[PDB]
Amino acid sequence: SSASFSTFKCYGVSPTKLNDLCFSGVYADYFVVKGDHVHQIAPGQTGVI
Amino acid sequence: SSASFSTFKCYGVSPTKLNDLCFSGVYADYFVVKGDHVHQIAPGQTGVI
Ligand SMILES: CCCCC/C=C\C/C=C\CCCCCCCC(=O)O
């Protein structure tokens, strides 16, 4: 596809193990920000967003 | 030089001790990727590269 991810980061699970796991529930939240506000989307951060 | 490094990150080594160390063997791998693929060159990652 044409996604071309620049940032991909996970907590509580390691990326090399996702192919061997089963989940009981998954949710997906989606929105649009600007480039300087991307680092703000993380647990334990501060700022306007 | 004209390298102008943008990513310099080391594992199993502190940058401030590189001048006081002696090594039994050193290998160097080199190649070309694109800008959004640079973060994939690290242990324990996923992606196409
Ligand atoms: C002149 C400073 C005097 C006060 C210093 C001490 C307290 C305040 C410290 C930090 C202020 C951070 C600014 C807001 C940053 C938001 C996050 C971001 O934008 O990503």
Side-chain angles (χ1 to χ4, degrees), chain B:
Chain B
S1 82
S2 69
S4 167
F5 299 114
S6 198
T7 299
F8 170 44
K9 156 55 163 223
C10 298
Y11 319 86
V13 142
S14 292
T16 46
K17 322 284 256 192
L18 287 171
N19 280 345
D20 311 4
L21 285 178
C22 279
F23 301 109
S24 160
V26 175
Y27 284 109
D29 309 327
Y30 54 100
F31 53 89
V32 188
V33 284
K34 84 169 170 181
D36 287 28
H37 284 167
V38 184
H39 79 99
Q40 283 190 34
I41 315 304
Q45 301 271 301
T46 39
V48 82
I49 303 274

